[model samples]
Target chain A: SVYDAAAQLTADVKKDLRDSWKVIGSDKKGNGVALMTTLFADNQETIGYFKRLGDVSQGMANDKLRGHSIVLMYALQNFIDQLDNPDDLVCVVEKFAVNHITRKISAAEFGKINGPIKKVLASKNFGDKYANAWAKLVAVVQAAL
Target chain B: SVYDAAAQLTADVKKDLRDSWKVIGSDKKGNGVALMTTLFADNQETIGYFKRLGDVSQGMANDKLRGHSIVLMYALQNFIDQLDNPDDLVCVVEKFAVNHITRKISAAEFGKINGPIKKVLASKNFGDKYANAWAKLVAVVQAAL
Candidate 1:
């Protein structure tokens, strides 16, 4: 099922993502900051996860937050873009895992991001089916992490 | 005098910038977007320069913006980081100019960014002396453009 989730995200789900990409893709910087903000808010204890963002105000304007957020937005876009090519998806996820490890972020911490991330998508009309699709995609990424 | 301005940025000014690099460098992503946002606001017409960003809202989260901004922040940081090495700075600026031109961004439009840029740096406590240093640096980047 996990493998199917990542590799076989249905054509219908892919179409859904492609169709709605524009909506969520717009305002990436805002989306990035908002996503991180929500993550930190919901998982208050994880505030320690980002030592660079000293406080909430600073986190809002923090350069690391901005850079990391954009990187993620685009990275996810890349994953979606290359979904048809599972090998390419594997490579991206591998590199992503390596990069996060280098940053000292553990897989456990990485797994916690999904909840808030899903909430953000839901707000933008990301349907339950597509949500499941995204989870599958993230599941692959989590395994790599 | 123009040559001197770019070529002879004082040792003291470079030192001042190097010392304060911590503030801006910490959030390369945040600073990059903030800088671009301010530039677009000041020169509204230049907004047309980014065709990839369908609208201003898209500009905020657009993948291109994220990549380009980080590239710029790092480039400028590199320029400052290598103040003692004009040869290195020249190489960076030349490559930068070519990249912009490839994207069909004119040197004239490229040059207009300094004013709002200077304003942003000033807000961050980039002093007048270092402001002059930054201007000189931008002058070199402009000449390359």
Candidate 2:
């Protein structure tokens, strides 16, 4: 259910994802920028999704876009830390949907970012068997969106 | 009191404003532009109030500020017409507060616009002894902000 978007993820699945970056929950914030950089590596169509972030492009490093990447990781970091509390996370996602509603993003367009997510997750060095769990988590939130 | 902000305004006060420009609901959108103009005149300090609307000044004919003025009148138009329904209107004003909160507009700064409001109302040919009523309505919504 949309209202229970985050509630769909089980505790075990969430724990498996906790070691991401080992946790995009990094104190340094570099992981987010790195994820964004990796996303932009060969994805111009993906960059087009956030054109308003700046004149972002392959190999480009403007603060305008980088600034967003900083918050991007912070937001995911926040999502992972609250596995025990889906109520608040669900409400945030509901509101977050509205924020992007105004900007008119495409679900299919956003879904395409999963490729980047996989590549970035692969580089995070955990030999993690959790991308499946991560994908399920993402799909739930994706449906809510 | 915060949640009940719009409820503070009486039905009479709201009714008295229905004929403004006579009803900023006019098919023409010029009334809002006029209000913006009157506010800008003799009020460089006020023009600075919306400098982001594009280098606004005492006599700016630029579409920048004028565009804002158009929406300004329409918004007030909306507020006036919703007098019969305080619940929706209150939610709008509450959320509207967040929209401006991002811009950091000062309460004192917005209060200064009262002078412009008075001048515009005076010119609307609305000698129906309703400025005070309008002020009360404004005060209620203003506090919600």
Candidate 3:
């Protein structure tokens, strides 16, 4: 079953998401900020997504950006935990698909953010094994969207 | 080109996304939290997905939950912005499929999340019209994955 596949994700790979985020450097919140920063930096125009912080470079210190950054990390943590259960995770991703409709977000744009996020992951020595695990999780999420 | 479908998404439908999230209550961050909350609440078993927050009822107030709630919002935000670009988006989705192979993540797992998520959106008064638009998007994403 679809649910079964999620439950069956290899244990070591799943552990990587839980363990690797912290190893990426800084506290989880700080790491989250770095991840989002790279995403916004690489996709400079994406700053428009944040109404308050239209440009992260200038608004990096802004409360909204900072707060949003942490929220992102938390969401991801929650998501990583559910990598084994796609049914549960898909709901989360689906919400984005609908809510983002008005935002005019496309799949390509979503794809681009990974560049910065990947850089952060690689920097922390996440290696291909963990990267591969995360990639599957991401594709499944995108598919759900 | 492949982008033509985006041109047909309709103005009000797009506007519906922005307004609907607000009407559901909470800004993007809070909305994300609320959505995740409902997901966790209804699927209490999903709490196991989190290492520390094994119980969403108890974990809802946790900082990690708060942060994750927000990360989900940003991810969704990024996703919506690209709803118009499928070709580009599929590349990203394909990446996930390839990477997931070694980790044992399967396509079926990705399909499971939709049911619970749809219930949440419908409850939020997300409307059938917008739902249809999102369905189109999800199908496209799934095909690529």
Candidate 4:
């Protein structure tokens, strides 16, 4: 089920990314920018586990990858650097949701992705603390987009 | 203390951002297409709430303006769209830090701007539940180049 949702996302997102890369490359001098910008944290691979969704231009086309990259990048780098308490899972999801919603991605699209996303997390069994922290990211992506 | 911290951050990050904008701009897209794309985003006002940031970029330098614009267009947009909840704040910050620490920007520089960056949330404190999301974006600029 998760793969099913990912199937659509991966295909559409990959295509969009290819298009954006082309735009950047075709311009005057975009000779070699890595398609992925290495957006995750170095502290733990879990945070680093995120997939780079390309540039902001893609956000205009579909907001999910936009939301995913943005929230995932922030969570792994800044706030978590200062964090010293129990992690916040739902908030992460909310942040992503908000980003997507702002982009008009719709709650329904988010709903379709949630199951697969959670399953991915469950497989990780990152423990309650890490899970909670990761979930917060997931929430943000869902809510914002 | 917060004020002192904020002042320090402003001074430090300004310098860091200057150096970074040059490198990423130089290394990635020498001609300014990346910058131009951002100008398009600013002019378009992709998101309703951030229309002002887009407008403001038109006045900045190629590097500064593009840096700020891209931050708004790519970083800010991604954050807002991906933001699912407030609790995962740490995670978002972490990823942003990755961009800076990895060579896009410096850690010391990022640490300085982190405060005023957070304070930006005051702008939308009352409307549409998207308050303070931009504030969280400070780390990425500092962390990445």
Candidate 5:
């Protein structure tokens, strides 16, 4: 029942994009900077979750938290038209990344968690096709600076 | 209740890490990683929940939903450890993002939900710093690559 619900929802949403937004699905899956704001409430905890997952450790969560916050603010409200607590989300995700990525957490842990989740989430769209997409997103974000 | 058990487990695990394994009390949060792994194996529905929440809307659910699986993985695992599925926890938060951050759903809809359950199982421990170490783990993996 749940899978069916997910499948239907996925299809319905796809249809809406094609019809209303006039969007053709991108083969490049992960970079939906627009989509990042869509799911999480632009909150500290949710953003922190991303920061923490991206690289491992709270230390990275502390340091990189701001960049992520900035991304949210820069993207969510003005660009994407989503996000309620834009500042908080932007701030927290960046803080988490800085704290953990720069100081405490190791990249290996970050990759393990990030890679799996990226794969896991992308699986919803297309089994393994999105793995490269995940890598691309990571690379793009990392190269941003 | 799973929350109570998860909390107790969090305390116990941390305590064990502190007393026997030499983990510092302040670092006890890392124990959450173990709790997360246990939570994953603890249930099958965890993945399903993540998939379900992604269906809220298309841009929110499908194309634009960038980090649902990643955020949801940690949060949902924490939730499941607390008796809710962690992956589901990730999805629930992702849904919140979809609603609040992206505005795919209404603010009224976001407010209706209480947020995902992030349960920390086991007691405190000195060596337990390795437990809640998602951030660190991810960081290392990322760095190595």
Candidate 6:
């Protein structure tokens, strides 16, 4: 039985996720970097979150960006793992909610992140299946806000 | 546009994956260990891949197991992250296909790994969206066999 929090994905939908993840999860750090880089480039405000990275720009590769991407991916990975399980998901979501407060992050910021997420997924080129799946998942997470 | 190699995952299916992964990817190491542990337990033969453990009897946590799980998660993370992007997916899949030879892993071995993947995913309780998703994903990888 599916948990109340998570939407009941169709059978094939589940497979789409499974297959898509196998590919995306393959490059956690790079994908994470790719994702964050895009997010930063798309929205200048998001860059405010990281104090380590001063206001500066260098195309392609940089130590600060790459390092932050590593941690970001780790957190995102943790975020993903706890999703399917109801109780676990709730726990992490609460923690995430709490952190949002600590950072003074508002719903707008949360909302802003989604675009980059879809863009990155689509960058995979076959996100036709996983993109919508992620949208639903993000909906669940945002509902808490 | 979807790539030639990847099946035409429906729009809903894509959402299923994006949502489901946010949970599983959260606990990369734990999930990785959970998957590998189950695999080793389910099939003692699989344990042969990691020679370091030298016959494990203790349960729950272990240094050797956790260390290996870390690396495994890293590799699997790489594996999952690449599945969506057609070119990236193909490159990694071929590398994986090639590694199969280096490890002497055959079709049976690849097929056998699928169960542990699903079980660990299902353990999260929302594999409904991801299990079938994963099955399709695995099918793509195994077809390379």
Residue-by-residue lDDT tens digits, candidate 3, B1-145: 2244334545665566545544543454456566677667666655655554334564335545654565555544444544444433333334333323443434454444455446657877776765665555444434534
lDDT of each: 0.65, 0.57, 0.55, 0.34, 0.31, 0.61
Clashes of each: 5, 4, 21, 89, 100, 50
Ordered from best to worst lDDT, the candidate numbers read: 1, 6, 2, 3, 4, 5
Give the higher-DockQ candidate: 5 or 6: 6
CA deviation > 4 Å runs, candidate 3: A1-12, A22-26, B1-145
Give candidate 5 misplaced runs (Cα > 4 Å): A1-92, A102-128, A140-145, B1-81, B84-145
For candidate 6 chain A, the 10 contiguous residues with the lowest summed lDDT are A1-10
Candidate 6: Cα lDDT at B10: 49
Candidate 6 per-residue lDDT over residues B1-145, each given as its tens digit: 1134356444565566666667877776578678778888899888777775544544235545654554445445554565555555544455455446667776668778778878987888865567777666666667666
True-structure lDDT of candidate 2: 0.57
What does candidate 4's lDDT look like per residue over A1-145, in tens digits? 1212222233333343333323332321111111122212112232222345433333323333433444433333322321221122222233333334554655444434333333433443423443343344334444434
Stretches off by above 4 angstroms in model 1 are A1-5, B1-145
TM-scores of chain B alone in all candidate structures, in the order given: 0.81, 0.80, 0.61, 0.30, 0.21, 0.79
lDDT of candidate 2 over A1-145, digit per residue (tens): 7545566687778877786636544532356556676667756557766765566553225544544554455446545644665654554454445445565665555565566667666766544466666776666557655
> All candidates' TM-scores?
0.48, 0.47, 0.45, 0.25, 0.22, 0.46
DockQ (Cα-based) for each candidate: 0.03, 0.02, 0.03, 0.07, 0.02, 0.03
Residue B136 of model 6: what lDDT?
63
On DockQ, the stronger of 1 and 2 is 1
Per-residue accuracy of model 6 over A16-82 as CA lDDT, tens digit each: 6556667776776578667777777898877778655554254225545554455455555554554
Worst 10 residues of 3 chain B by lDDT: B90-99
Model 5 - which docking category? incorrect
